[PDB]
């Protein structure tokens, strides 16, 4: 315990210049798949204590043990803030748990999903079968392709909500954090329609987040809000979300119209009406920058 | 000299099996074995100075504000005009600095059993150990379990238990007799705030503490949590309890606080801290 020379065997360490000088490590019981698509390095492993894990370019995308915090917040923060959402786009794929979360909403008629990397969808469907059932809902339209693009095929004003479940800005998601993409989402949303994006750590990425929020305040003339939640296996143990609405009926992201936990899937594991409001209560160092 | 990344510090414990937060080490500043525990201080590359006790991260300069502001302001902003407070558990004096932010306070007793924690924190974290210099502080080097047993019944407005984990010297601080001793020491409507671990890692431990507190404390019993990146799972929680007496609403601060501005705590995040995820709320509010 003295000098850090003896490496204990059997660990995956998540190291990146996006979180310099630190790493989250998980003990690996077995590698289920490891390969390299046209887009990124793809790992599925069985961890000792977080269940199965998807890793892309050495970055943890999800674990079975805590994906409920991310998947339920990214989905229910937007969808519980608008009445009777019917048509939803999800940009970015995975184990389908976000599709299952969208499908909890009885009003939903069409769930479009765009994921560039068919490799990630294929191995996710095979190794997370209990959650990849989300792909089998008859409302789901899965497109393998670029999200930036898919939107250009998209009818103006046709979506109630767009959920951007992206990887980090280093990799295939790079342009999903930039202005043209956000302009493209705004066009696709109805008046008063909402976007919810993966918006990184207030502990690690304040400069990046400042630029996201600035870009959003300029494009989205309705509400622009930033929420955060606990996800142990994302860097610093938190991740945030941009919530924005376009010009049109007013949206109050902080007080949900229709909280999904209030009323097939199990009970919500994480989301409830009170933690929906709590997610907008940022620490003082952040609240002063973001607001 | 075990780590999972050559040259890095990795926090490994059976209290969080199968995971480790690792920090790159610029230089080891101190290594020692007290009468109670192994003590390390190191300059991390990106989190400033880090205090480690028995291989467990106790604080880092970069995020200690989240823990030190919530553990002090949650209890003290929930009661009117607190005057006399007890801190159990030593550190860099950051908790003392946050208690001192309250003008109403007249007396801050602190009891830390391990002289080496205090000495190391004063030597290596001097910019924050100015907490110990406020003239209201009464630093006792002593067993805090003993100190509460010998405390005058009804004499404290608040007790803050800023402890290490249940494996090591702090073991008894998590058990029912210690909690009964705290209830005895608090005035009617007096409050306790204890370090109460991770809802993601420790639900069985937290369920038992909650159950013990409901048995002992007939005022309010509530659990709060906050973000601290360098505690395992990225969160830590607190037991807030008040004794029978004047009502205490821990969720809405009756005594909101205004030398640097608060970095983390504010009135809105005070209430937010009590909004637990559905899996926990169900167990804790049972």
Numbering used by the authors:
A (entry chain A): 37 to 299, 303 to 330
B (entry chain B): 40 to 297, 304 to 331
Quote the study that presented this structure, word for word.
Longer polyamines are produced by aminopropyltransferases (APTs), enzymes that catalyze the transfer of an aminopropyl group from decarboxylated S-adenosylmethionine (dc-SAM), a universal cofactor of APTs, to a polyamine substrate. Thus, spermidine synthase (SPDS) utilizes PUT as the substrate for spermidine (SPD) biosynthesis. AtSPDS1 and AtSPDS2 share the fold of polyamine biosynthesis proteins with the characteristic two-domain topology. The active site of AtSPDS is formed between the N-terminal and C-terminal domains.
The structures of apo AtSPDS1 and AtSPDS2 present the PEG molecules (absorbed from the crystallization solution) bound within the active site. The conformation of this linear ligand mimics PUT, providing the information about the substrate binding mode inside the catalytic pocket. The bound PEG molecule stretches along the polyamine groove, resembling PUT bound in other SPDS structures. On the other hand, both apo structures, even though there was no ligand in the dc-SAM binding site, presented bound PEG fragment inside the polyamine groove. The asymmetric unit of apo AtSPDS1 contains two dimers (A-B and C-D), while the complex of AtSPDS1-CHA and the apo AtSPDS2 both present four dimers (A-B, C-D, E-F, and G-H) in the asymmetric unit. In the apo AtSPDS1 crystal structure, dimers A-B and C-D (symmetry-related dimer) form an additional extensive buried surface between N-terminal domains of subunits A and C. This covers about 8% of the subunit surface and involves 12 hydrogen bonds which is recognized through PISA server as the interface important for oligomerization. Additionally, the SAXS results showing dimers of both AtSPDS isoforms suggest that these additional interactions are rather the consequence of tight crystal packing of AtSPDS1. Similarly to the other SPDS enzymes, also AtSPDS stabilizes upon ligand binding. This feature is even more emphasized when temperature factors of the two very similar (in terms of resolution) structures are compared – apo AtSPDS1 and AtSPDS1-CHA. Apo structure, where no cofactor is bound in the binding site, has an average B factor significantly higher than the complexed structure. The estimated molecular weight of the full-length AtSPDS1 calculated from the SAXS results is 74.5 kDa, which almost ideally matches the theoretical dimer mass (73 kDa).
